[PDB]
Amino acid sequence: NFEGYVEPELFERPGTSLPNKLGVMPQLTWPNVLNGTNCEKPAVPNYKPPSKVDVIIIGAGPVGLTTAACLLRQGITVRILDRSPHPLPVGRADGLQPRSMEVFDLLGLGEEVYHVGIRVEHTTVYKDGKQHIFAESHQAPGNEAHYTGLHACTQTEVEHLLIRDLIRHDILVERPCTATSYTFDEEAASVTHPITVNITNEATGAEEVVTARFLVGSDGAHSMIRKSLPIEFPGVKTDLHWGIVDAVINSDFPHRWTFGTVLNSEYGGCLIIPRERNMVRLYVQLRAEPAFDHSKWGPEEILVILNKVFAPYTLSYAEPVDWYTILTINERVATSFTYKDRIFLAGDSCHVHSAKGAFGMNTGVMDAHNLAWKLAMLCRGIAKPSLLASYDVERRENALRAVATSARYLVVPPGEDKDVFYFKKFVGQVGRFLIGLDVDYAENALNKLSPAVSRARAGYRASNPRVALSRSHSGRLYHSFGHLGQFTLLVFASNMGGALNAKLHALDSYLAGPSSFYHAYGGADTFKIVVVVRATPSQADQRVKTFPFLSKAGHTVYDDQLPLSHFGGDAHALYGVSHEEGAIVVVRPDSWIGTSSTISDARSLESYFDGFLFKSTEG
Amino acid sequence: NFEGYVEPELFERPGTSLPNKLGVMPQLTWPNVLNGTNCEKPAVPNYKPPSKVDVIIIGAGPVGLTTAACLLRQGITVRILDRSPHPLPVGRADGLQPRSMEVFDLLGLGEEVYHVGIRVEHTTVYKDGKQHIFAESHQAPGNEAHYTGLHACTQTEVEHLLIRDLIRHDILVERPCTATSYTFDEEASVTHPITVNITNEATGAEEVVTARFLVGSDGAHSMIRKSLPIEFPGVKTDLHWGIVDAVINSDFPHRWTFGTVLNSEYGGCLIIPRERNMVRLYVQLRAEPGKAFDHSKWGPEEILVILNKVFAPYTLSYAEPVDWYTILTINERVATSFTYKDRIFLAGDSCHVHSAKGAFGMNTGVMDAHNLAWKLAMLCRGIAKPSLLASYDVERRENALRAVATSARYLRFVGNCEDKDVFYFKKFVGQVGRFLIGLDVDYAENALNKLSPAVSRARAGYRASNPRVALSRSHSGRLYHSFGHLGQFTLLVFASNMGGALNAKLHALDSYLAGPSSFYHAYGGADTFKIVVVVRATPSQADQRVKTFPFLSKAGHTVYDDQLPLSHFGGDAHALYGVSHEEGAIVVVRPDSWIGTSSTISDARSLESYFDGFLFKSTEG
Ligand SMILES: Cc1cc2nc3c(=O)[nH]c(=O)nc-3n(C[C@H](O)[C@H](O)[C@H](O)COP(=O)(O)OP(=O)(O)OC[C@H]3O[C@@H](n4cnc5c(N)ncnc54)[C@H](O)[C@@H]3O)c2cc1C
Ligand SMILES: Cc1cc2nc3c(=O)[nH]c(=O)nc-3n(C[C@H](O)[C@H](O)[C@H](O)COP(=O)(O)OP(=O)(O)OC[C@H]3O[C@@H](n4cnc5c(N)ncnc54)[C@H](O)[C@@H]3O)c2cc1C
């Protein structure tokens, strides 16, 4: 006894971008599926969110939505709202770095961001009509990374998939609902919910107050929550300007379309970004003088200056403009990202960078990811103040790093071009940071450097080599990690023979005891044991069975890859583990290395966990 | 009470390919890990292979190894031999099509073939120094397919990853062992009517093995094919390709992008990008007038002079010693039959040989092996009627006959030679460019493929669509992820939102299937089928309704068809398979992921005679 299915109602939203001589593209959308509460038949039926919530989220852009989704995966009750009546129809951010892709894949959303748009794996450089560079680029090593290159997947499409994931968890974005004010009882231990937020529905007029444990401010560049705190938002209004267009553009450019840069020392530079559906996005330098004037800079105006930059190649529109705008470059970074461990900024509320870098969605999503697993452990009370302090530190300084490299985006060998040689050297110094594999967290309570392995480094990306999860399934070591509420204890065990056998038996006895760090901080509620055995699956299952605690609570994985070279790379060599001493690597929930230890030193982790965690016991 | 871990002995095997002025690269290997029984201590300790196995495999090239790997998933007992003392050090095939990627992914080996080498997603075409074409190519659409483009993954890497997968299953390739002779008692009923006579050519020890079935993956000069009254026709063009893998420097504006460089005077060149900054260049070499072709005349250095004539005015020069070099003579042949009395089966180059240029050999070979192995497994289980191994023969032979035809069309212009050369290539790409990436592997009707109008798009004998779906509230993946294992058909029960008209029909089907005489139970139950209920609703809405059908929730697996409506921002499984929300559908998906048939929810009885067309009745447990 259920109603039949009805196909969702298409609406072709018109385009708000300035047109060209062909028009502005409309944008396909489905308001009932995508507009949250602001619709006639909501994708979640009879959605009745509570008045008391663990986390309230102001802002339902890419960063708020990611935060919503990571929390919902940990069982944290959540409400989220956004002032706009519908998600972004087109434009703004347009692609993801390899490391952003890794994040979605760890959340179970890898298929939604992969193979949406095109893939960028090459770069070109031209100067004054003459090709200088065409090369493979944006690469990650296959024996350490699944994803490589940049991936076109726009902000619209990211909002779509994240809204659909919230729906799958029976959560809707409340639109179009503004958070007008909020209170924080800084003074009151007895209280659980010292936050109240007044919400006003700009469609219907109804007000509301929610009480919440924690508040996440992800409301963009002009954040009211940031403005309400003793936080400053310093930066430099460069007053340099980009004209940006997204469209299908016919050209005789030999490399249509390839990521890269077209330099004219005469007329300034152009940046090419290939797009889905035979489109290209073109950034172009914009300078005006006889004060910067927005009035005479339309889509057709910049195509005229574009043809001057690509001489002798010429560009002509083949269809109506998909997107278009002028951007002012202002880079800003909040002095702090936390406040009293109750109000938390993430995304454009914390930092604003030039669009050119493409950091906002990428750095934003990685902010939400860093925040959400720490904030979630705060909701079940095992998080010491240090843990959420590491959020502010780790992501603020990464925001500062993004600011330095965007500034310098802008001594030569004799037979060499001055502006192209500083490009190859730029690509060399920051290339891996531009793809996310070199996001670098300095030492803190969570990142404890250790010489126990020669290569895996605290505060740095965990390496993702190929391993066998079973006899039949040969995938990636990331696939064995725990969920967002657990730390992954990588226990490298060699082939569990030689010297290490005794040490592993010791290790087994330490861990089973109720005073072990595993048991001391919650057992399987906060840890996932992975035993990495460099042996055949039959030799390993045999041997793992002699270790009663390891067999009974560990998940064995088979490190059966060929030795490190251009034909292989096992986890032991790629993490830098000694076959005599073993290792216990602590991978944080977000995939970054936390610390490491030898099998003998497994007791050193009691101190390491005490730095940011309170003791806990499994359920 | 276990010995400590010893790191594998590395050996740099010298190259046997002719050098350039800088030499010939050695090739990294690890004899104790990769050479099977023929090493000092094997990677499977005390491999004691039985003298009586279900299936014995002759040849451990990509095809034989793939066949072993599929059978070992199924619990078939297997012995696999190869005359050669080690696997391929370098060269021959260098890449996989998107559809071969899907085949590895279904076997659980997708991560071993992805991100091994480079990826080809673009084509260029030059003629007489002027560029004519530079575009995205080899695309598959993302709302239907995970992989797209060409993936560089060599025969060497493929053999590596398949040998390692056999080690995980405690199987070693028996090297360097030759099947000298074999007997097949057609007289008698015995379980094991095949005996194979084996000589190790290292130690001279002979041995006899008894098998239920024999697989001839022994290559182009298959001894097994010759023993059988099976013909191997085709034409030997004595057209010649010069092939060279090397790091090559060039001022070519597109170095290196897949494509073709034409020169009117000097013929043509095919480009293939490779890992580690190499490139593969095919170039035509033509025999002088009257005289036969003289291999003696063409080394790496000579080939490079022809390449610089073909690429004028851009020049090429070696930066490193040659990684690989050979002269292939194109000779395309197909066996008149691929099976023999459903006891000896051919797969790979023993069945068909192609122009390397087309890169058919390894991709079709893996797909043959895939096709063969699941049918052969049901034959070992007993449930296979002869009609099914018949479908192996005609599916793969016909596909081989198709593959020959498209390169016969390609190779006429290239040997011969608004621009009419580039025009014929654009049309050629538009016509076969998706069979060339494998999505148009197209099986004609037979017992296994019955066309059915119950759905608008899914089609018997064609590739099952792979749209995005949610497998849980937090895991949004692909529909292939729900499919059964290699000895199961996937019963894709499209159920709409389980509401309206269909609620009644689906309640009937629930009680139909639960009976011991429904097609599900009659042909094996969970031993032959997996049910997937594809609900176009939200997860908790779907979970609730599914609870109201007791057999479907008891025995089916719910996936959530929650993408946006089919467009450029989405595509639900219901729309991409062509299901009507009034009728529903039971799309039957074969083990290899080709569509078998479909019916409406009310026509569930129609599948009964479908499965009797090629299966014996079975009972779970
Ligand atoms: C015009 C423009 C162009 C851009 N171009 C690029 C680009 O080319 N490349 C790139 O990488 N990045 C670009 N960005 C940045 C990118 O859009 C953001 O970095 C990314 O969306 C992350 O921002 P966010 O999710 O934190 O918030 P945003 O998406 O900026 O906005 C957060 C949301 O909060 C809501 N909100 C604000 N105040 C309230 C309130 N009081 N109550 C309720 N809801 C509220 C807003 O409605 C908004 O939807 C651009 C941004 C803008 C504005
Ligand atoms: C020179 C050359 C170049 C090629 N180039 C390309 C290319 O560019 N692209 C492409 O896609 N394909 C190419 N191929 C084809 C590719 O090598 C084959 O398609 C692929 O190996 C599949 O063949 P197969 O596994 O069936 O047999 P193969 O790998 O060719 O050989 C089968 C195996 O059987 C073994 N064997 C033979 N007889 C016996 C016996 N009596 N007892 C035991 N073992 C035996 C052999 O030693 C060998 O290991 C090339 C092949 C060759 C020979």
Residue numbers in the entry:
A (entry chain A): 6 to 193, 195 to 296, 299 to 418, 443 to 651
B (entry chain B): 6 to 193, 196 to 424, 448 to 651
What does the paper say about this structure?
In this work, using activity-guided fractionation together with proteomic analyses, we identify an NADPH/FAD-dependent monooxygenase VibO as the key enzyme performing a crucial ring-expansive oxygenation on the phenol ring to generate the oxepin-2-one structure of 3. The crystal structure of VibO reveals that it forms a dimeric phenol hydroxylase-like architecture featured with a unique substrate-binding pocket adjacent to the bound FAD. VibO, on the other hand, acts as an NADPH/FAD-dependent monooxygenase catalyzing oxygenation on the phenol ring of 6 to form the oxepinone 3 in the biosynthetic pathway to vibralactone.
In the crystal structure, each asymmetric unit contains four VibO molecules, which form two symmetric dimers, in line with our analytical ultracentrifugation-based assay. In the dimeric VibO structure, each VibO monomer contains 25 β-strands (β1-β25) and 13 α-helices (α1-α13), and is composed of three distinct sub-domains: the FAD-binding domain (residues 1–127, 141–245 and 336–419), the middle domain (residues 128–140, 246–335 and 420–472), and the C-terminal domain (residues 473–653). The C-terminal domain of VibO adopts a peroxiredoxin-like α/β-fold, which directly packs against the FAD-binding domain and is far away from the middle domain. In particular, the dimerization of VibO is mediated by three different types of sub-domain/sub-domain interactions between the two monomeric VibO molecules (the middle domain/middle domain interaction, the FAD-binding domain/FAD-binding domain interaction and the FAD-binding domain/C-terminal domain interaction), covering a total of ~3436 Å2 surface area. Specifically, the ADP and ribityl groups of the bound FAD are embedded within the FAD-binding domain, whereas its isoalloxazine ring is located at the interface between the middle domain and the FAD-binding domain. Notably, the co-factor FAD in the crystal structure of the VibO/FAD complex adopts an “out”-conformation, suggesting that the bound FAD is located outside of the active site of VibO. Further careful analyses of the VibO structure uncovered that hydrogen bonds and electrostatic interactions are primarily responsible for the specific binding of VibO with FAD, involving the main chains of G66, V68, S89, D356, A363 and M369 as well as the side chains of R88, R97, Q160, R287 and D356 of VibO.
